[PDB]
């Protein structure tokens, strides 16, 4: 079972390569390609990887981006025992990122606020007003940075006013790319080893 250390090394190379290409697809708004690469990484995760700090950090970011990418699909669940919307799950992953990456509350508060805003607004646009109130109460009633935002969303929910500028001016594309720029700023930017060896093979 020295072949086990061989597969572990290759699986790490493969995981890091497809993570690099998944970030590239997300950056280019090629979310279909991101989905397909995400599914490759999911299947690979059942295999032995040894372990790094790099793998744990990239899998957390991959976890967060995948929930954000599915955030407008309220039929999707990332915990079948829970009843969380995808963007609610993204909030929970962000908190795990804050703890495991040892980030301050000041560094994560703005981007976390963006997820809270999107989580409530998506429920509003699906006319899931009861879920929107539950997310609003849980995640904004205490957050000091979302007090004005909470004030606007409370009236939108009560009036069921999907035509409010807060709802209509919201851009999920802008939200997604802001989240990627934040998450990428906390990761190593090196090119994966498989990519470098591919460039030399095609020379």
């Amino acid at each position: 079972a020295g072949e086990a250390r061989l597969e572990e090394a290759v699986n790490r190379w493969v995981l890091k390569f497809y993570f690099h290409e998944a970030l590239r697809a997300f950056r280019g708004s090629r979310y279909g390609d991101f989905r397909q690469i995400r599914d490759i990484m999911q299947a690979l995760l059942v295999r032995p990887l040894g372990k790094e700090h790099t793998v744990s950090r990239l899998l957390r970011v991959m976890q967060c981006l995948s929930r954000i990418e599915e955030g407008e699909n309220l039929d999707c669940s990332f915990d079948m025992e829970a009843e969380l919307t995808p963007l609610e799950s993204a909030i929970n992953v962000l908190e795990m990122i804050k703890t495991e990456f040892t980030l301050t509350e000041a560094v994560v508060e703005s981007s976390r606020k963006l997820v809270k805003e999107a989580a409530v607004i998506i429920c509003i646009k699906n006319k899931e007003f009861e879920k929107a109130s539950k997310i609003l109460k849980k995640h904004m009633s205490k957050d000091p940075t979302t007090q004005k935002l909470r004030n606007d969303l409370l009236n939108i929910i009560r009036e069921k006013n999907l035509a409010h500028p807060v709802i209509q001016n919201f851009s999920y594309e802008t939200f997604q790319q802001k989240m990627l720029r934040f998450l990428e700023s906390h990761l190593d930017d090196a090119e994966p080893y498989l990519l470098t060896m591919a460039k030399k093979a095609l020379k």
């Binding site: 995400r38 995760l45 976890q63 999707c76 669940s77 990332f78 915990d79």
Partner: peptide
């Protein structure tokens, strides 16, 4: 080890 996709 994580659930990436639904």
């Amino acid at each position: 080890x994580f659930x990436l996709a639904p």
